[PDB]
């Protein structure tokens, strides 16, 4: 009977970087998914293995809400079977994905004159991230055989870059807040 606290995830003042993505377990509550779909404040609301319309009446054993900020061009990569820096080294979804990806522009909140250096992404990784895998490591990347010693140089580079979101930038390079709702402990999240 207690309504699920989606407002905490969707309306969080500060969102996380894609490399350090945040996960909240949603359990023991009732959530109206259709209210979000008809919220209409979302540029992207794509549901996989389900329809947004019928979501309102269903129950799921476990719900996880993953929240991060990426650029507008990279929203396409937060989808099943996708390739690219965000998909390969930051956030990965399973090919067998059942859930919904919701995104909105955050330029009003996550962009700063002079740039917002707080939001970061991983450009370099030895291997691709497996689905739902988080690497928050800040160790120097070795692109060559020569060792690094925690120090940068040729073949040795910091693995994270900053979006540097600025207000007058184009929409693709602008900040977007993404919430991924993942659905599959007895059922603890019933739709009305």
């Amino acid at each position, epitope marked *: 009977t207690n309504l699920c606290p989606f407002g905490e995830v969707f309306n969080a003042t500060r969102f996380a970087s894609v490399y350090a993505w945040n996960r909240k377990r949603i359990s023991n509550c009732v959530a109206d998914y259709s209210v979000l779909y008809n919220s209409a404040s979302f540029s992207t609301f794509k549901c996989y293995g389900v329809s947004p319309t019928k979501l309102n009446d269903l129950c799921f054993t476990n719900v996880y809400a993953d929240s991060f900020v990426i650029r507008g061009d990279e929203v396409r990569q937060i989808a099943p079977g996708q390739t690219g820096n965000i998909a390969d080294y930051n956030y990965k979804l399973p090919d067998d994905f059942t859930g919904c990806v919701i995104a909105w522009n955050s330029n009003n909140l996550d962009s700063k004159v002079g740039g917002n250096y707080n939001y970061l992404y991983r450009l370099f990784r030895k291997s691709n991230l497996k689905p739902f895998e988080r690497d928050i490591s800040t160790e120097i990347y070795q*692109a060559g055989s*020569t060792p690094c010693n925690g120090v940068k140089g040729f073949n040795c580079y910091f693995p994270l870059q900053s979006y540097g979101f600025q207000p007058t930038y184009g929409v693709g390079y602008q900040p977007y807040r993404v919430v991924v709702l993942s659905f599959e402990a007895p059922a603890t999240v019933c739709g009305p």
Partner: antibody, heavy 117, light 114 residues
């Protein structure tokens, strides 16, 4: 099919400059750095330098600094070495190689440069 | 610049003989963090490009015959061929990847005494 392909022969007039190519295939070009090596006939291998195709970061030997400039074309997956003020001493086979998982496992056939008028 | 010294520059050996080739470095090629030595060995047969035989001093590449073995730590390194074969005629080079500038030795030419 990892292939590093270089032109087999180049003829350069003395005092001029040669830019030579190392077209790469079978792999993501940005992922692997490219090294350049010189062999004077009947003699050993000498390192000229290396380039990382992602940012064009370069490292050179003090002997080849000011003699060799390394460049890359990401679209063509091609790496280039430019040699300047060519002299008979620069007449040699120049090789392009890829630093992969374990040092230089992928090498090119080599480019033989003859400095003659 | 790290200096790698190969002695002898050339050696002649019989088939079935054991050959030990030396690489000596001015600086230690040992990385304390991993206990790995950053030296590599290459074989250049006549008319052909260099081919990696060993990396990390002792680690042989796939396809490389079992006779080729690498040994050493710090400054003194060796390449061992057990039962040298006639196709083993080549010039062998040692390279260091511990630091840039990357450096190569003069090379040792294995020749066959018949």
């Amino acid at each position: 099919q990892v292939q590093l392909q270089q032109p087999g022969t180049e003829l350069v007039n003395p005092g001029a400059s040669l830019k030579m190519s190392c077209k790469t295939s079978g792999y993501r070009f940005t992922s692997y750095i490219i090294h350049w090596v010189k062999q004077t006939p009947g003699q050993g291998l000498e390192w000229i330098g290396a380039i990382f195709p992602e940012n064009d970061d370069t490292s050179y030997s003090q002997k080849f600094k000011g003699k060799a400039t390394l460049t890359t074309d990401t679209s063509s997956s091609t790496a280039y070495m430019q040699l300047s003020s060519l002299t008979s001493e620069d007449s040699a086979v120049y090789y392009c190689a890829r630093d992969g998982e374990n040092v230089l496992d992928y090498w090119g056939q080599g480019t033989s440069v003859t400095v003659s008028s | 610049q790290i200096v790698l010294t190969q002695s002898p520059s050339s050696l002649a050996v019989s088939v079935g003989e054991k050959v030990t080739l030396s690489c000596k470095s001015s600086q230690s090629l040992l990385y304390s963090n991993n206990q790995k030595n950053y030296l590599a060995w290459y074989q250049q047969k006549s008319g052909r490009s260099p081919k990696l035989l060993l990396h990390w001093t002792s680690t042989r590449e796939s396809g490389v015959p079992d006779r080729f073995t690498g040994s050493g730590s710090g400054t003194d390194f060796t390449l061992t061929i057990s039962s040298v074969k006639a196709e083993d005629l080549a010039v062998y080079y040692c390279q260091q990847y511990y630091t840039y500038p990357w450096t190569f030795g003069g090379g040792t030419k294995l020749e066959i005494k018949r």
